[PDB]
Structure 1
Amino acid sequence: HWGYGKHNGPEHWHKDFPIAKGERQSPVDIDTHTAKYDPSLKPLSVSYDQATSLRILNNGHAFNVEFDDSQDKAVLKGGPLDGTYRLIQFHFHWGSLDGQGSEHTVDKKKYAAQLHLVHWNTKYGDFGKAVQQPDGLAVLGIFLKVGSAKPGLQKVVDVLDSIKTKGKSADFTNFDPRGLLPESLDYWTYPGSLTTPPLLECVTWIVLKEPISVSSEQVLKFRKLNFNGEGEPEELMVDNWRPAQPLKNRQIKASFK
């Protein structure tokens, strides 16, 4: 079905998901000079101290770490959000080289990878209903640049061997997502969509200004993953990112000046 190759890549997605050419598609390029500082925007409130990770899984497009979202144990609120959003999973998008990999870009600059922490608005009851609403999800986006190792990402890096191919999964408990956060929580925000099919326009994007750095050896491990299932020809999982989409009639607000 869909993927990131030339025959099923992002340029082909519109044929099965017409909304690919919609009005609030993601990702986008963040032009730092036309972004509007908005002093009425509140600080983000990330409460991940009760977070419960359960499993890590290679879904053939990326790898996801899933959390128990049966109760308000890891939530996001504040910022441009109203209500509570529960963390359901986080995943990454990365490139084949260090100069590409992120989905969002800042003044056209691409980062080595991009981490997405996905949350759904609890007023909707479950994830499936939330994706059907304009204010259903809140995704926290964090850029990764190659530099020094991120201690808090190593646990994730070491388990990849066990989920090398599509469909593989592994128990992944007691992982603390707080170890992936940059020091500052300043951000840009705009209304957008999921960056993979079905590309629903149900997301309030919150992109952090400050990147976290990971080491070259850490990102290398990501690139060893496979898109294919076991027993199939090896297709390295790299460049699983969608290019920037037209901003159209949207404004990017910044929480800092």
Structure 2
Amino acid sequence: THWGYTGHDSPESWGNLSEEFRLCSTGKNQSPVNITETVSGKLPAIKVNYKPSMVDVENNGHTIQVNYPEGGNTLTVNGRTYTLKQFHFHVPSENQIKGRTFPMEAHFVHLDENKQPLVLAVLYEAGKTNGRLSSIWNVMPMTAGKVKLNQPFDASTLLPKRLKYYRFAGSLTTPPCTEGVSWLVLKTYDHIDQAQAEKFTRAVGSENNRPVQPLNARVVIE
């Protein structure tokens, strides 16, 4: 069913749209969340192996998504290898750190061999222009459609130096709100100019952040 962020299709109503979106309102391990209290722990290191690839940018009406038709771009964590399937954006951010909403947030969606999803999240602070995002921003479809990127894109450039992260379990922030998703939110933020965030919104048609959900029985580790 059609769903959105405004009108009668807003996040508060996703569960009433179709029986398949039921977990959006009944789930107890939903995303995004407001990270306030955390438990300090010895978290395992992240091994990222991204390479210049043949990707295609897409405007699906909900976000601007960069699709990877093939494998080869991976993330290894605690012995398990996850393959990057796609990455997209949210303006403003969905997850919050101590009540702070960020200008933008990127979600790098991965899937392991058993099809278990893992999302790596990057938060952006308001500031200097990001040239690393220009290659995608300049070809950004202003309307619903896909555009093949002529030059190979290297997602490695979109990741910080230090890969320390916050770890918790959650779900997809969009319908059907499937749970069983591991979330790794990077502690080191990147940046964007207020104008970059603005062009995004204009292309999508509205802010596309889902409101924060209750942590419930969950503990966030840092």
TM bucket (normalised to shorter chain) is over 0.9
Report what 1:45 is aligned to: 47
Give the AA of the match of 1:209.
K
Q: Supply the distance in 2 between the matched residues of 1:201 and 1:112 (Cα, whole angstroms).
A: 26
Q: Supply the distance in 2 between the matched residues of 1:54 and 1:154 (Cα, whole angstroms).
A: 15
- Aligned to 1:223, the other structure's residue is in SS state helix
- Aligned to 1:36, the other structure's residue is in SS state coil
For structure 1, which runs of at least 5 residues remain unmatched after alignment? 95-100, 125-129, 131-135, 227-236
- What is the CA distance between 1:18 and its match in structure 2? 1.5
CA contact (8 A) 1:52 1:68 kept: no
Aligned pair 1:113/2:113, yes or no? no
Q: Supply the distance in 1 between the matched residues of 2:206 and 2:189 (Cα, whole angstroms).
A: 20
Report what 2:206 is aligned to: 238
Give the AA of the match of 2:127.
G
**For 1:13-59, what per-residue CA distance to the aligned partner results, in whole angstroms no more than 9, with x for missing partners?**
1112110120110001101xx211111x211111103x523211110
Aligned match of 1:93 in 90, 94, 112?
90
Q: Supply the distance in 2 between the matched residues of 1:37 and 1:85 (Cα, whole angstroms).
A: 25
CA contact (8 A) 2:22 2:176 kept: no
CA contact (8 A) 2:167 2:184 kept: yes
Report what 1:139 is aligned to: 119
- What is the CA distance between 1:144 and its match in structure 2? 1.1
Report what 2:192 is aligned to: 214
Q: Supply the distance in 2 between the matched residues of 1:89 and 1:115 (Cα, whole angstroms).
A: 11
- What is the CA distance between 1:82 and its match in structure 2? 4.4
| TM-score of the pair, normalised by structure 2 | 0.93
Aligned pair 1:77/2:76, yes or no? yes
Aligned match of 1:151 in 111, 131, 136?
131
Give the AA of the match of 2:108.
L
For structure 2, which runs of at least 5 residues remain unmatched after alignment? none
Give the AA of the match of 2:50.
Y
Report what 1:98 is aligned to: none
**For 1:95-142, what per-residue CA distance to the aligned partner results, in whole angstroms no more than 9, with x for missing partners?**
xxxxxx1100001110011100000012x2xxxxx2xxxxx1110001
Give the AA of the match of 1:48.
Y
1:113-192, aligned counterparts within 5 Å? 113-122=104-113, 124=114, 130=115, 136-160=116-140, 163-166=141-144, 168-172=145-149, 173-192=151-170
Aligned pair 1:13/2:14, yes or no? yes
Q: Supply the distance in 1 between the matched residues of 2:207 and 2:160 (Cα, whole angstroms).
A: 24
Percent of aligned pairs with the same amino acid:
34
CA contact (8 A) 1:53 1:65 kept: no
- Aligned to 2:138, the other structure's residue is in SS state helix
Q: Aligned pair in 2 of structure 1 residues 43, 60: CA closer, same or farther (>3 Å)? A: same
- Aligned to 2:31, the other structure's residue is in SS state coil
Give the AA of the match of 1:245.
Q
Q: Supply the distance in 2 between the matched residues of 1:88 and 1:253 (Cα, whole angstroms).
A: 25
CA contact (8 A) 1:28 1:247 kept: yes
